[PDB]
Ligand binder design. Structure first.
Ligand SMILES: Cc1cc2nc3c(=O)[nH]c(=O)nc-3n(C[C@H](O)[C@H](O)[C@H](O)COP(=O)(O)OP(=O)(O)OC[C@H]3O[C@@H](n4cnc5c(N)ncnc54)[C@H](O)[C@@H]3O)c2cc1C
Ligand SMILES: Cc1cc2nc3c(=O)[nH]c(=O)nc-3n(C[C@H](O)[C@H](O)[C@H](O)COP(=O)(O)OP(=O)(O)OC[C@H]3O[C@@H](n4cnc5c(N)ncnc54)[C@H](O)[C@@H]3O)c2cc1C
Lengths: 459, 459
């Protein structure tokens, strides 16, 4: 049997752990899927590449509004996929060879499970290929996996997820997307801009429900005009109709479509770990971690979607930085460790219009009994919005009336993820709204003026 | 003669002075040109509207690179001008009626000059229409005016400036722009994107020279490939060629063109005031003001291009806010006034690629003997740059090695004026580079990751 000093399960954010501090130790890496993780191969990086291609097509269609008559001749979807994955797929191989060729790091490419803890304190790990090894410290970065509704699974129909829809041969004529999350909204923007008829079948009343109701209500109204929105509906059955699909809904109506995309959420991969056999406690479906990313087992850390409540890459990277430091630091030296901070976490949804938010919502501050001041500023009231002829873009700020500090920031409009950054800086470092408005300069007539005027308007 | 409490010369930024605190005094407004000023009618607002229209056309032309085959059918230049100025021109009428119809405000629409000071100490003002009146307090906001080379004026050739070139009937086939400032660079981007052949005749060696040399050198190289750049050349003579022009250069070569655009700089309007007859001192060609915007004459303030060294609207509005407060404040109570802030002034040039900068450049910090750290981060190294397939976007940061604070920030690329705002906030409030990188969250995979990596790369 082989002995290792540290074993990491998952090459997502856990790949960024073995640095030069581990040059004298023997490490083992486990990756049941493709090297690199989810974000690179089938996640954030390839999706936003398709989004920018969609944003190019959206500009051409609405060019007539500005005085330029243009039209799209062809959408070479085959070359778009080749351009996207021609950059990503070779990256996964280079990173895989960089770790495998290292003499002190050994890579296992099968599903690894937890075994009973050995007498000496070392953790036994077993792979689905039949490999057994031990490690003093163990890092859990198993991530998450998609969830498919049981009614869709029991139907036996051909469906697609975010993991497989990005490598399709030809663009369909009509697609049905089941879901209302950030994945479902971004894909609706991609296919619609490329010329596909999009139909959203959501079970709730608003798209992107966990956003502020002001944003969700305005965006759901705008989205309902460009896409076919079926609210309060659930898919109960379906059958093949050739290359397409025929799905029956909970109200008796049936929908014919060429492709079915399931985006009903994701849950952690902790259930396929046998963590109970090693002393790691699991609640709901996630791994229990503390402020030092320490689990209920001595020497075992965890990070990423497998434990964190935020399924975001910028959060998983902050937890990977905590694991890197709190590792080499004795298990009980909590004064010499670093605490993971989750205060003011931002998020963005790359749709049309783009949405980006950070902090509490208006109703969330009300539920906490805070005396708040709210201002909603439109893009069309700023000089840059005049050049854009914008008629829907907004930026919403919530501040505590007493302290004058920012409580929440919700933007829905052009360059939402970029204009939200100066607002993230004020919240993270404790800058009051009055200081952000008049304490610095804003270039005229740049776009961030809509954030400046929103602060001035906070009556 | 008419008695007034306050008289303001210039309805540009000076219009934002008359508040409800003066709702009982008799005020006089002077506007020799069109109401609203330079920025709205013939400046920033209409120019940046044409820029966005040009940026839309630029996206369609290079759309094939991303997999979308498109082409521009027609450029309705007449509808672009009508859409822009159909929105701007009525604003000048509404703002003009808003002041004239007020019983306490009287509007004079001719050029106003300074007269000899009256015996009682009040300032006499005379307009070119024959109106004489007096005022207790005077605000000078005369702005600036374009500068035309003497060789072009003595030639008798038909030339255009930023005040007149935007309302042309039909787009020319070939245009020549004489100048290297921010005005000349933005207009070269506008006409080139709309299909005009652009030829730059600059007197120096680099385009946008007063910017960081790293930016100027890279931008001048890019501009030389899409536009015809003739460096170290000056127009010495010219003659009409029909609807076009034939210009003679300082090296004997002649250029035939359809339109001539002059962007060789601007000069303050203080020289056309007879200001020495009222006791207000003039240096160079601008009015001398102190840190409280006070001139050398008791009761006389000044703001805008007529005095400030920075010819920017966001600076002229900050100076108008200081005048508005220190006006209503006793002339000798300097302890109860507000100081004009010129510490971290930003600027942007809306060209292709877009440029935005704030603070000192690398060569400026060297001349001051500061131990600095410099990092140049490429757009192509961030996840958003992959979706953009960017190959030229950069962000340059200069920090003091000792204090660790930001000394300068120079960006050349997509969303330059928007990406620089979080950097302006850190400099204006005293945030260190290490705090900006790891003290807050950056949305993945948003564009501001290039600013985060530029801070992380500093060593
Ligand atoms: C379509 C899509 C778009 C997204 N867009 C964004 C976005 O814009 N911004 C953002 O912040 N986040 C985004 N995310 C979320 C982001 O991708 C994840 O939150 C992030 O990848 C989680 O990192 P991780 O390393 O914990 O998970 P992963 O990167 O998935 O790491 C888990 C890896 O380990 C493997 N593994 C699991 N269990 C085992 C085992 N027992 N043995 C061996 N190997 C195992 C898995 O196969 C996988 O390769 C998106 C996700 C999706 C699906
Ligand atoms: C093409 C162009 C683009 C620009 N783009 C930008 C940009 O993107 N960002 C930016 O920050 N700045 C920009 N500027 C600069 C900006 O326009 C000025 O810095 C700002 O408008 C200064 O305001 P002001 O009120 O002092 O000048 P003005 O707005 O010109 O005010 C002066 C007004 O008073 C009148 N006047 C002058 N003298 C007299 C007199 N004796 N009697 C009566 N009336 C008089 C003038 O005719 C004029 O109408 C640009 C300028 C130009 C020309």
């Amino acid at each position: 049997m082989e002995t290792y000093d540290i074993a990491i399960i998952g090459t997502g954010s856990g790949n960024s752990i073995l640095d030069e501090r581990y040059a004298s130790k023997r490490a083992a890496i486990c990756e049941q899927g493709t090297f690199g993780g989810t974000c690179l191969n089938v996640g954030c990086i390839p999706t936003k590449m398709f989004v920018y291609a969609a944003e190019v097509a959206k500009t051409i269609r609405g060019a007539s509004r500005y005085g330029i008559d243009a039209h799209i001749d062809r959408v070479r979807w085959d070359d778009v996929v080749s351009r996207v994955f021609g950059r990503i797929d070779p990256i996964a191989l280079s990173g895989e060879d960089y770790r495998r060729c290292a003499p002190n790091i050994d890579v296992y490419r099968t599903h690894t499970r937890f075994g009973p803890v050995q007498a000496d304190g070392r953790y036994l790990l077993r792979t689905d290929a039949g490999e057994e090894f031990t490690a003093e410290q163990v890092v859990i970065a198993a991530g998450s996996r998609p969830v498919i509704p049981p009614a869709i699974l029991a139907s036996g129909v051909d469906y697609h997820t975010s993991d497989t829809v990005m490598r399709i041969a030809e663009l369909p004529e009509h697609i049905v997307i089941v879901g209302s999350g950030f994945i479902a909204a971004e894909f609706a923007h991609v296919f619609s801009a490329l010329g596909v008829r999009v139909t959203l079948v959501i079970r709730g009343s608003c798209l992107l429900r966990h956003c502020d109701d002001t944003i969700c209500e305005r965006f759901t109204r705008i989205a309902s005009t460009k896409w076919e929105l079926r609210t309060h509906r659930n898919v109960v059955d379906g059958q093949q109709r050739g290359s397409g699909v025929a799905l029956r809904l909970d109200d008796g109506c049936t929908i014919n479509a060429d492709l079915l995309l399931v985006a009903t959420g994701r849950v952690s991969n902790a259930d396929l770990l046998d963590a109970e056999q090693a002393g790691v406690d699991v609640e709901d479906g996630r791994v229990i971690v503390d402020e030092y990313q320490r689990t209920s087992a001595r020497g075992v850390f965890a990070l990423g979607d497998v434990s964190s409540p935020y399924l975001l890459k910028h959060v998983a990277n902050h937890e990977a930085r905590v694991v890197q430091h709190n590792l080499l630091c004795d298990w009980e030296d909590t004064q010499s460790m670093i605490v993971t901070d989750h205060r003011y976490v931002p998020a963005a949804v790359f749709t049309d219009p783009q949405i980006a938010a950070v902090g509490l919502t208006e109703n969330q501050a009300v539920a906490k009994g805070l005396d708040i001041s709210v201002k909603i500023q439109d893009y069309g009231d700023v000089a840059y919005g005049w050049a854009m002829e914008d008629t829907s873009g907004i930026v919403k700020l919530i501040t505590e009336r007493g302290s004058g500090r920012l409580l929440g920031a919700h933007i829905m409009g052009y360059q939402a993820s970029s204009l939200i950054q100066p607002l993230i800086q004020a919240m993270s470092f404790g800058l009051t709204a009055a200081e952000m408005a008049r304490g610095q300069y804003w270039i005229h007539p740049a776009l961030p003026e809509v954030v400046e005027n929103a602060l001035l308007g906070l009556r």
